[PDB]
Amino acid sequence: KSAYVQRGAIITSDGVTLAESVKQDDGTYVRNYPHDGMASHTVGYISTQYGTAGIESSMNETLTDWRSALYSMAGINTTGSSVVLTINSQMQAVAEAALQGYSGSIVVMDPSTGAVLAKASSPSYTHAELGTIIESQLVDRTTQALYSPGSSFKTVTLAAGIDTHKTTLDTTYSAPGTMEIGGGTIHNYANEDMGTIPLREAFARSSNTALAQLGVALGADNLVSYARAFGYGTALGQDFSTTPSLMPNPAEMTTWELAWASCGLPVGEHASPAGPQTTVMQNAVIAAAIANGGVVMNPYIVDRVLSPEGAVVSTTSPKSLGQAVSADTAAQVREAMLGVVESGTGMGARVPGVKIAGKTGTADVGNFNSFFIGFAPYDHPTLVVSVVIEGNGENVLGYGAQVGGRVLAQCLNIQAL
Ligand SMILES: *C(=O)[C@@H](NC(=O)c1c(-c2ccccc2Cl)noc1C)[C@@H]1N[C@@H](C(=O)O)C(C)(C)S1
Numbered sequence: 085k086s087a088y089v090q091r092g093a094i095i096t097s098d099g100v101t102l103a104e105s106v107k108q109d110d111g112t113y114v115r116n117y118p119h120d121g122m123a124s125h126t127v128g129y130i131s132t133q134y135g136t137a138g139i140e141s142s143m144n145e146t147l148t149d150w151r152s153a154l155y156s157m158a159g160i161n162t163t164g165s166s167v168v169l170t171i172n173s174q175m176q177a178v179a180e181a182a183l184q185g186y187s188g189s190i191v192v193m194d195p196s197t198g199a200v201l202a203k204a205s206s207p208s209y210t211h212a213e214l215g216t217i218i219e220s221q222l223v224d225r226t227t228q229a230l231y232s233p234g235s236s237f238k239t240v241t242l243a244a245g246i247d248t249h250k251t252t253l254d255t256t257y258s259a260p261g262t263m264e265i266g267g268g269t270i271h272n273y274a275n276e277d278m279g280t281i282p283l284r285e286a287f288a289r290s291s292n293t294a295l296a297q298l299g300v301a302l303g304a305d306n307l308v309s310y311a312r313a314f315g316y317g318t319a320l321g322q323d324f325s326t327t328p329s330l331m332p333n334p335a336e337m338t339t340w341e342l343a344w345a346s347c348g349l350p351v352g353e354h355a356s357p358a359g360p361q362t363t364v365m366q367n368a369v370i371a372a373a374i375a376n377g378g379v380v381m382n383p384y385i386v387d388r389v390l391s392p393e394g395a396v397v398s399t400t401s402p403k404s405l406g407q408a409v410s411a412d413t414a415a416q417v418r419e420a421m422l423g424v425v426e427s428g429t430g431m432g433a434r435v436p437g438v439k440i441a442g443k444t445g446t447a448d449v450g451n452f453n454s455f456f457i458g459f460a461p462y463d464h465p466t467l468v469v470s471v472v473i474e475g476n477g478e479n480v481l482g483y484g485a486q487v488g489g490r491v492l493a494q495c496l497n498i499q500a501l
Contacts, residue, residue, distance in 0.1 A: 124210065311360060
């Protein structure tokens with residue numbers, strides 16, 4: 085009976101329709117996807133073969149007595165209501181252009197609300213291609229793929245160390261090329277001996293040996309608690325599905341495992357999952373919480389629902405998942421992240437004439453992935469970005485940062501119009 089009931093439209097915040105139902109002469113309705121290929125994973129689909137995904141799935145209730153027995157009356161009475169997303173089409177096009185030629189994903193988010201302004205996964209597909217045989221492409225690498233976050237997770241270790249008042253940005257750390265911890269070995273990248281340096285510098289240069297010592301000083305309970313307070317263990321998304329980011333049961337962790345976890349590498353062996361394992365969306369949520377004075381927002385992608393004749397049925401409200409760190413801690417972490425871009429591993433994210441802050445990472449998976457989270461402008465951030473570029477075959481060292489800065493710069497100009 086449901087082919088005869090018109091399905092509501094899915095529309096961007098700037099007024100671009102990405103999904104629509106069209107009436108047949110038959111009486112039935114056919115699902116049409118204008119600008120087919122934009123925000124495909126987010127818009128989603130309902131397919132017998134390929135399953136259901138995205139807004140088509142999560143808002144299916146919304147987009148979907150005596151008259152019900154008459155199929156001829158299904159068309160007149162009740163139309164589906166439409167969904168206006170928080171996605172902006174120009175920011176979406178920006179994120180999609182930056183992923184051309186690469187596998188991975190980008191999220192652009194408003195740090196004060198958690199509104200998702202761009203959400204792109206690559207490789208992507210068109211709805212036309214769902215009517216044919218295809219495999220990778222269908223995985224939503226923003227929300228439904230887990231990755232070792234590598235050094236980008238040091239944002240959480242740093243935040244926890246500062247928030248528990250166990251260290252400060254100017255506290256010095258030995259940052260040798262190799263160190264014995266928990267009866268195993270931790271190395272800096274390239275075995276680089278950095279000598280004794282302040283934590284802000286250990287963070288800007290992404291020393292594993294330094295940040296591992298902080299993780300060990302923190303202990304497993306604190307490291308796991310802080311990860312969870314940033315959202316680990318929560319299925320992020322008010323109105324979309326994200327697979328929870330994972331940490332171990334702290335009681336099961338060893339010291340060596342702890343050392344590695346605090347650098348973003350999951351090496352545990354126990355009943356509970358190894359961690360951290362992250363989504364890109366979770367990485368955005370962390371950057372956003374840091375950008376927003378420590379207040380974690382549950383991200384969302386629907387702005388509002390519109391009745392068939394264009395009335396506002398309802399509006400999403402921003403909702404907090406709590407205060408993960410104090411405002412004072414957040415300002416310190418923001419400062420440390422500025423250092424990453426101004427003088428450490430994130431210089432590829434620099435954009436002349438605007439202050440960009442962030443944290444980079446690289447995780448071995450002979451393949452490695454490149455991560456970046458960041459926000460801008462440094463003073464009064466209005467945007468957050470989270471990026472993964474998957475190596476696969478290629479060396480992609482530093483690519484996440486170059487992509488991140490580019491996306492932020494172009495999204496700021498869009499914001500400005
Ligand atoms: C965290 O991402 C860090 N990554 C590494 O150190 C990592 C290594 C490596 C080499 C020897 C012993 C242990 C490990 Cl994990 N191999 O692959 C990567 C490079 C640092 N962060 C990165 C950046 O912020 O992206 C680096 C490249 C500066 S190293």
